[PDB]
Each structure stands twice: as C-alpha cells, then as structure tokens.
Amino acid sequence: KPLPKAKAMTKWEKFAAKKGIKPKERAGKMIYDEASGEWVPKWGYKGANKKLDDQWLVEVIDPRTLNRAERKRLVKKNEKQQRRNMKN
C-alpha cells in the first residue's frame, strides 16, 4: 500500500501556529466539582455536564431541553467543521 502520510491542518493548526496558543497539556478527565465531596470527571462517566439535567431547580419551556438542544447544536457544528475540513 502507499504511505499513509496524508496531511491536513483542519484550519485549526494554521491559527494555532499564527497565534501563541500552545497545545493543551491534556491532563485528564478528572475535575473538581465544587460544593460536593466528589470529583465527577468533566467527561467519561456521570459527567458534570449532565448535572444540569439531573438537578432539581433550573430557575430562569423546560431549560433542560434548551441545554440539550445547545449540546446537540455544538455537536452538529463540530461535525460540520469536520466535514468542511474533509472537503479540503
């Protein structure tokens, strides 16, 4: 087979090189959840991002549905960006 050395900057590496944005250290999923005695990592299992859905009062249509729609919109935007980068 030919060499798999395909290259593409995805439009992000170009900006990261233009700016002084160093790559994130990529520490881990764990993040401290204040007001509680548990870590509940940012993502991976029982993520804190899902906390807003399981909590009891959402002061200020159900706002939980709005948050879920926002999550779906962000995921679809990421997928669209991936498709755009694949087009190149």
Added chain:
Amino acid sequence: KVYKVGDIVDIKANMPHKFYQGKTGVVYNVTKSSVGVIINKMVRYLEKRLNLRVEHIKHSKCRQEFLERVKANAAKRAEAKAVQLKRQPAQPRESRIVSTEGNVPQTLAPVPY
C-alpha cells in the same frame, strides 16, 4: 398527580444545587418534564420564576383550613338561623382543685438516685 396552573405547591426536596426547601409557591406553568413555580423574594418584593421537576413538588394543604372553616361557619349560621363564629385564642385556664388523697406529693430529690 396532575398539577394545574395557579395551584399552590410546596417545594420539598428528596447535592442541593440551591437552598429553597420548605418554601411555598404558586404554579404558573406546567410541562411534561417539569412544573413552573413562582416564589416571591424581598429585594418591595421581587419574584423568581423557578422550574422544578414533579419529583420534588407536592400539593400544599395551607388553604384546607380556610375552606373547612368557611364551610363550618356557613353550616353553623344556617343551623342557628332556626352566633360567635370567630376563632378565639387559647384563654387562660381557670382555677381547679387537686386532690392528694390518691397521689401523695413526692419530693423527687433531684440527686436523683
């Protein structure tokens, strides 16, 4: 239970994410996922548009006493028409004699043993 707009419910919780337990409000909106309750709060009094799931909400019996008293007063007036319906605070107890024949006063001796 089928909650309806305008009903009075008590915000009872089953970690916190807030401290509103024990407060009562009136339902202003209802949906499948949650029930909307409005709670008044002082700055003049402001208002908060709370939204809570049915799991942490229950009906309030605050107005049960009012309706029961109204019905009892109406019935009493109807019966007496054939009135002093006003509620009265607990009046001071009157004098009463106590007999020690069946119970000798015992010096409890707070030692006690």
